[PDB]
Amino acid sequence: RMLVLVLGDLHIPHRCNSLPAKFKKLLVPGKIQHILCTGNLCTKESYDYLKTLAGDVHIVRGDFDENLNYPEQKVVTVGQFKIGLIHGHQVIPWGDMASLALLQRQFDVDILISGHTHKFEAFEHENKFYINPGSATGAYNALETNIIPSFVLMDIQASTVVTYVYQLIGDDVKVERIEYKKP
């Protein structure tokens, strides 16, 4: 079993000062095996924090990230699953399904993770799985009407991934779970 934290669009410190305290309390160092970050940290402070949580941290370049050297996209394999990672500001219209499906095929991944919209998504489409963790800080963006903080945790064993979404609803954390199987 491999636990994979998925998060991004924190926008610390220009839009938000910190991760929500109850999210931070959930992330105990050593518990999680892999971290996949969609970008827009936007400073080294947040990268240092993720490195205190896990030994394998991946991050792609957001459109506000100070570190322009983060790769623009990444493919990581965890167990039986090949996973694609991109921030998503490059896709116009934002979140466009046909464009994300084209990315899925070109990366040749079972799961495609993107961000940028600050809207959590977790869904299957033509026998592939698509995840957007939303914004872990609830950072505003150009469009949306104030944002619920969220992050995702993938629980991977054999050919099954159980995707958990954590949301800060008012002042309390609530969860939802979705199962996916490699066909």
């Binding site: 636990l3 959930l26 945790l153 629980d155 954590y166 609803i169 969860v175 939802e176």
Partner: peptide, 15 residues
């Protein structure tokens, strides 16, 4: 356990 986002119940989670 944590409460579910939608509905009334609770869900076990890995953290």
């Amino acid at each position: 356990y944590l409460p579910t986002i939608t509905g009334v119940g609770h869900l076990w989670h890995p953290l």
